[PDB]
Amino acid sequence: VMVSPLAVTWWNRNGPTTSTVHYPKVYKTYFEKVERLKHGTFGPVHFRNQVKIRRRVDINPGHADLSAKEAQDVIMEVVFPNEVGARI
Amino acid sequence: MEDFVRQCFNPMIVELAEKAMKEYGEDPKIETNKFASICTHLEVCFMYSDFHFIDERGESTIILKHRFEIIEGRDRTMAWTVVNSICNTTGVEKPKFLPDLYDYKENRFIEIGVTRREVHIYYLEKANKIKSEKTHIHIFSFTGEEMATKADYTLDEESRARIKTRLFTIRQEMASRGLWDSFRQSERGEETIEERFEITGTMRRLADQSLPPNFSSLENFR
Amino acid sequence: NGLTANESGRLIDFLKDVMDSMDKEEMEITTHFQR
Amino acid sequence: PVGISSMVEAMVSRARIDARIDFESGRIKKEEFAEIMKICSTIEELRRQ
Amino acid sequence: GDNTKWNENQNPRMFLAMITYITRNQPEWFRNVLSIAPIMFSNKMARLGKG
Amino acid sequence: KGKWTTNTETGAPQLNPIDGPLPEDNEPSGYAQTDCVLEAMAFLEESHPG
Known part of the structure; x- marks a missing residue:
């Protein structure tokens, strides 16, 4: 059906409340980011010439050294155990 | 041999066997010994399953819950998902190779095999192939020879005798046809068909007009 | 149009089907008209 | 999913x-x-017609 | 520099020749499937927009 | 300045400038030489074997 934006706001103030405890666990990466940021410590700012080199860097503070296939297999085992198939 | 399989079996058995054999990319008109083996396998497994239920308490019941759940006669995906579901719900670890059926009274996957050769040789072959100790094995013979793990016959004597008689009568019918000696079972060799992609017909004609000026056919330019 | 070579789902099978269709002598299409 | 079977x-x-x-x-x-189970049997029979 | 009329001066026949050379000593089916696309592009018709 | 042909399957005119006359002016040309392109591909293969 077609609904107005107001409905969304209505839900945000009158919708049915539900427990939210798995969200920090499920969205573990984002909460890891925020927790890491909050505990960081800053230092002095140095004004000097910066030389930046273009390089291939890995952006994943948390990863278990899995490729697409292994990651898919583990995800299927955890989330969709009955549909994993022949893989062990 | 084909017509005998079609006419001397229930339509469901032949349909399931044909669909399963097609599912591997093989033409049924070519392979018949494998077709006969798989249809006999389905018949024996269905008899091993049909007419056995489980009552409320959990004892034997012969004419509701079905004591035997079939795995053969299904796509790889369906069979694998049922194997995984049974392994997860009951607790028995699933095997690396697809079993044949599952019993809930014993809560275990049982293999079924029907072969012309002696029980001992095929029993050893299947045991060393599956390499499984928690899955029951049952091997029958066309001549009535039949044995299972530790000589443990899950089915009641009457059912086993009925299945042996069914196997013997089908063997007698194939012998009457005269191709019993030239059947000798078969095994899945996993034959790989060479990939072919040929340019013929109108396309070829187009290919003959898409070359530099000094050429007249794709073969010459190649 | 009696061209079921792509049932396998492989792309190469679909290409074979396309070639066979180009080899067809006649093609049948469905058109929607509103009046 | 992959499969030759119908839905x-x-x-x-x-x-x-x-x-x-x-x-x-x-x-x-x-x-x-x-x-x-009865509804599944109904579905199977309707599949044929 | 820059190349002018890049898409007007490129011939599907030349791409056919390049693909034929690249796929040398390869299975025939592979060569056919790889070389059909230039053939199709060579005999191409363009619709003239809406009018 | 190419070869004009009539497709036998679609029945439409087609222009083939491959191996056509070499350009005589700096204007755009579509006359690509088959031998030159094959030589370039061969030399590329030589520079990066395999």
């Missing part, structure tokens, strides 16, 4: 297997299992 065939197979497993687990009463 209804896989659907009914999964329905039967899931129903049996759920009834075995004891999470569903016998009446619900019987009703879903």
Whole structure:
């Protein structure tokens, strides 16, 4: 059906409340980011010439050294155990 | 041999066997010994399953819950998902190779095999192939020879005798046809068909007009 | 149009089907008209 | 998913297997299992026509 | 520099020749499937927009 | 300045400038030489074997 934006706001103030405890666990990466940021410590700012080199860097503070296939297999085992198939 | 399989079996058995054999990319008109083996396998497994239920308490019941759940006669995906579901719900670890059926009274996957050769040789072959100790094995013979793990016959004597008689009568019918000696079972060799992609017909004609000026056919330019 | 070579789902099978269709002598299409 | 089978065939197979497993687990009463099995038989017969 | 009329001066026949050379000593089916696309592009018709 | 042909399957005119006359002016040309392109591909293969 077609609904107005107001409905969304209505839900945000009158919708049915539900427990939210798995969200920090499920969205573990984002909460890891925020927790890491909050505990960081800053230092002095140095004004000097910066030389930046273009390089291939890995952006994943948390990863278990899995490729697409292994990651898919583990995800299927955890989330969709009955549909994993022949893989062990 | 084909017509005998079609006419001397229930339509469901032949349909399931044909669909399963097609599912591997093989033409049924070519392979018949494998077709006969798989249809006999389905018949024996269905008899091993049909007419056995489980009552409320959990004892034997012969004419509701079905004591035997079939795995053969299904796509790889369906069979694998049922194997995984049974392994997860009951607790028995699933095997690396697809079993044949599952019993809930014993809560275990049982293999079924029907072969012309002696029980001992095929029993050893299947045991060393599956390499499984928690899955029951049952091997029958066309001549009535039949044995299972530790000589443990899950089915009641009457059912086993009925299945042996069914196997013997089908063997007698194939012998009457005269191709019993030239059947000798078969095994899945996993034959790989060479990939072919040929340019013929109108396309070829187009290919003959898409070359530099000094050429007249794709073969010459190649 | 009696061209079921792509049932396998492989792309190469679909290409074979396309070639066979180009080899067809006649093609049948469905058109929607509103009046 | 991958498979040569039609939608209804896989659907009914999964329905039967899931129903049996759920009834075995004891999470569903016998009446619900019987009703879903009857509806599955209905679906299978309608599949032919 | 820049190349002018890049897409007007490129011939599907030349791409056919390049693909034929690249796929040398390869299975025939592979060569056919790889070389059909230039053939199709060579005999191409363009619709003239809406009008 | 190419070869005009009539497709036998679609029945439409087609222009083939491959191996056509070498350009005599700096204007755009579509006359690509088959031998030159094959030589370039061969030399590329030589520079990066395999």
